[PDB]
From a paper:
Finally, in situ proteolysis was used to screen crystals, by adding a trace amount of trypsin in the protein sample (1:1000 w/w). Owing to twists between neighboring repeats, the a- and b-helices form a right-handed α-solenoid. Two copies of the molecule are found in the crystallographic asymmetric unit. Analysis by PISA suggested that a 1702.3 Å2 dimeric surface might be stable and present in solution. Because of the twofold rotational symmetry, helix 6b from molecule A stretches out slightly and sits on top of helices 8b/9b from molecule B, and vice versa. Of these, each of two hydrophobic residues, M780/M781 of helix 6b, sticks into a cavity on the surface of the other molecule.
A complex composed of Integrator subunit 3 (Ints3), single-stranded DNA-binding protein 1 (SSB1), and SSB-interacting protein 1 (SSBIP1) is required for efficient homologous recombination-dependent repair of double-strand breaks (DSBs) and ataxia-telangiectasia mutated (ATM)-dependent signaling pathways. Ints3 has an N-terminal and a C-terminal domain connected by a linker region. Ints3 also binds 30-mer random ssDNA and does not bind dsRNA, dsDNA, or DNA/RNA hybrid. Both nucleic acid binding and Ints6 binding properties were attributed to the Ints3 C-terminal domain. Here, we present the crystal structure of the Ints3 C-terminal domain, uncovering a HEAT-repeat superhelical fold.
Author numbering:
A (entry chain B): 576 to 586, 593 to 607, 612 to 624, 634 to 661, 667 to 695, 700 to 714, 719 to 898, 917 to 956, ...
B (entry chain A): 571 to 586, 593 to 624, 634 to 662, 667 to 695, 700 to 714, 719 to 898, 917 to 976
């Protein structure tokens, strides 16, 4: 047909393609092949002049689908996406004088979650800046597809820069971006335990940028392995110091192996016993009376704490709960911890 | 082969079990001309760290050895001075020994020997030896940092030289072991004196170096306020790491008046979301305290008035996102009215929206 050949001929191409647009209201692979063989972020992202580039030739298709009979013309762009995958995220770019991104769902249903993931991976590989400036709206318009698994989170953190991580934490702290949910955050961090160094630091900073209380994720302490997981251990230590210790947190801290090169437990216990002395004493007393966390593990962690607390002026082993618990407990492993029991005896 | 002299040193050369053979030389270099030691140390230098399992029964395997005996013979030292010339010439020939001594000092008594060795040119000696150690063996530098910072606080807390040295090569696991050492009372790398200047200097380092510096600072117990003036120096595009860490740590603070002064005293850029983020956080958890501080700042107790007003208008335009009665607090409305009364007519229509919150009902 000769109008489509006129569009081929010109290459102010908007009305020229509106010719085809008007004609596709009653064998499209050749049209989409022509369109594909025919064919992102402005350097200064200024509002309403970033849409200066959003016009142009191909994006006009998007426009004609943003206006019932709203269904008999997305087949063309479905064939475009089946030919050229990149347009899949270009649409997202266009959608962010459009209405709302509720069009993209309708576009996805011709291949939502796997479409979003592939388009976002292509965007990540090609243009990182576009992925940054697209992440908030993506996570907002599609929460039940993006908050469930660290796929998209890993995608972002694998390529993100420190300045891009700063703009992302800002977006989180401003009410514009939400990347975790109290449901999935634990699963997602246990998954994150396998990522690169800076990827894991980015994940943890982004989690702190939300307002999810530490306890929701303190079970992760089970999974934190001395040799294997430095970043999550460091962030969890530096955040746990700032918390009033619950009994479950001190159980989780004591339920980690005693390795002579592992300084997490004794560090956090020293901090707690110096600022929350009687509360920590109460919790470890309640733990000592039979609440693996074998008794000798608690005793060894406490003996490490005792041998360390001589560094400072700390009457923590004078607390009445701890001496009460020590004498109650003492009544095989005995010769191992004589000193400890001796603080509650002599 | 090597311009030579005395036969005890020649037996040590012949073997190359060398410990007593070398203490022979040690004892011989007591009643000696101080002219012929450069060739002895040249022989010793042309002659020539951490055990894989660092057990205080296999690190003392390495503290033995032939050269360390010199150190040993000086750790029983009046006549406590007349034998540092030999190792001074060793250091002038082979610099590495400078930190080996430190290693030796970490079944020795106390490290007050190292100063006596340094006086052969303490601070620049420490810095050169620690830089050489950083260059050669990072693992030794890590396992030596605590004692270095402890035995010489006034030499290592003075400038970020040593901190930069460590963070430039450190690993994430070694950064975790260092944060642990800090949190255990064994290592202190900042002090309320220098910490502010030291971080302002750190603002020029690489990404991961700055991340390490900030993590290590949080591992200490220096309150944020002591370093909150650094917000003046933090520039939006250029300093992401310090801004992000400062944001996530300011999140955990009940806002002081100086902290809100420092947050309000940074420029308003439409891509800079630091101030409005932290203000949103504060006004959502401690709304009326933040309002009290902004009232005391607005009645003037640099921060120009329009800067505060623009930051507050950004906060207002953002707070429509959520349910936040922060602009219903009485301190903030009282302050708004006080400001509006003595306000340039320009800023009246400039912030009409803002002032109307304290005017209309």
């Amino acid at each position: 047909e000769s109008l489509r050949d006129k569009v081929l001929q010109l290459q102010a191409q908007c009305e020229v393609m509106q010719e085809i647009v008007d004609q596709v209201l009653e064998s499209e692979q050749l049209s989409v092949l022509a369109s594909c063989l025919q064919e992102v972020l402005p350097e200064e992202i200024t509002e309403e002049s970033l849409e200066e580039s959003v016009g142009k030739p191909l994006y006009l298709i998007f426009r004609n689908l943003c206006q019932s009979s709203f269904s008999l013309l997305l087949d063309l762009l479905s064939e475009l996406y089946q030919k050229q995958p990149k347009i899949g995220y270009h649409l997202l770019y266009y959608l962010r004088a459009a209405g709302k991104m509720n069009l993209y769902e309708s576009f996805a249903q011709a291949t939502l979650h796997t479409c979003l993931m592939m388009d976002m991976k292509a965007c990540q590989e090609d243009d990182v800046r576009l992925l940054c400036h697209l992440t908030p709206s993506i996570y907002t318009e599609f929460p039940d597809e993006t908050l469930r698994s660290g796929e998209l989170l890993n995608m972002i953190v694998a390529v993100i820069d420190s300045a891009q991580l700063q703009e992302l934490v800002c977006h989180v702290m401003m009410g514009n971006l939400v990347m975790f949910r109290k449901d999935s955050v634990l699963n997602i961090l246990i998954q994150s335990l396998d990522w690169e160094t800076f990827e894991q630091y980015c994940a943890w900073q982004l989690f702190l940028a939300h307002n999810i209380p530490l306890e929701t994720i303190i079970p992760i302490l089970q999974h934190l392995k001395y040799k294997e997981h430095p970043e999550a251990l460091s962030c969890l230590l530096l955040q746990l110091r700032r918390e009033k210790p619950s009994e479950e947190m001190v159980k989780m801290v004591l339920s980690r192996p005693c390795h002579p090169d592992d300084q997490f437990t004794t560090s956090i216990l020293r901090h707690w016993c110096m600022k929350h002395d009687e509360l920590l004493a109460e919790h470890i007393k309640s733990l000592l009376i039979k609440n693996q966390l074998t008794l000798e593990q608690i005793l060894e962690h406490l003996d490490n704490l005792r041998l360390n607390l001589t560094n400072t002026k700390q009457n923590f082993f004078s607390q009445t709960p701890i001496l009460q618990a020590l004498q109650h407990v003492q009544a095989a492993h005995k010769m191992k911890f004589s000193d400890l029991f001796s603080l509650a005896e002599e």
